[PDB]
């Protein structure tokens, strides 16, 4: 294909390029910390009006 013919002579030719390909989609983010005050606004005791 890269040397279009049907009687290619003797020699070495560069045709392709290998490439080992992935096997996961690892995503690494840090730890959760200092959660927002959503526990005292959705689980409060009393509202006003």
């Amino acid at each position: 294909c890269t040397l279009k013919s049907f009687t290619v002579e003797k020699g070495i030719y560069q045709t392709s390029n290998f490439r080992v390909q992935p096997t996961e989609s690892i995503v690494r983010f840090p730890n959760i910390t200092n959660l927002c005050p959503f526990d005292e606004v959705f689980n409060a005791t009393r509202f006003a009006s």
Binding site: D39, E40, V41, N43, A44, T45, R46, F47, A48, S49
Partner: protein
Amino acid sequence: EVQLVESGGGLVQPGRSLRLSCAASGFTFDDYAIHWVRQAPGKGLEWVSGITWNSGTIGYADSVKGRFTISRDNAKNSLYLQMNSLRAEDTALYYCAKHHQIAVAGDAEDYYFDYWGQGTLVTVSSASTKGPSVFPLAPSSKSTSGGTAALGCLVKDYFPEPVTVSWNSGALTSGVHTFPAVLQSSGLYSLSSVVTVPSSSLGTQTYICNVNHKPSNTKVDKKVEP
């Protein structure tokens, strides 16, 4: 630190309305509950209403429902209390008390006051406001000891009693015996004060008795002379 200054209060006719305020200063007006509690003269205290750290009503008493409405303003850091249809049994010193705990989310309802203020005398009657009458009590020349001579003021003819006496600028916290007022069988009251007043040799106070009365706003700056 905490300065719970209270504004709004005076003589109003029975059946009218007024707005009370309590400007907070010193802490964060987003995590401490502030309530309203009245105190009749020499007849104990009485809780009116209260609001938690957020905008939330915690209830009223058994005699103020439907007439009183409390509101909280976290933006201006001030708690307001509306009073409608005031009657004769609403004359007391309404205080502005805070709460000690931070009122976490999951706990038990338990409110107890930690910081108190001064209160505003909210008197409700049919009488009218009268103008005070300051008089320069003569510091007579009776001289036996060092500071035996004393001068003061003779404020009288005033129905409400939000009386605050000053001498120079709101200072001189030394011995000043401000005698309480008394109803002289006519609704009016009478104020007087006594200072040390040492030997007068052009080295004494400015001889000024500033009397501030909110329902009868008038700046009296009369001097006292022997």
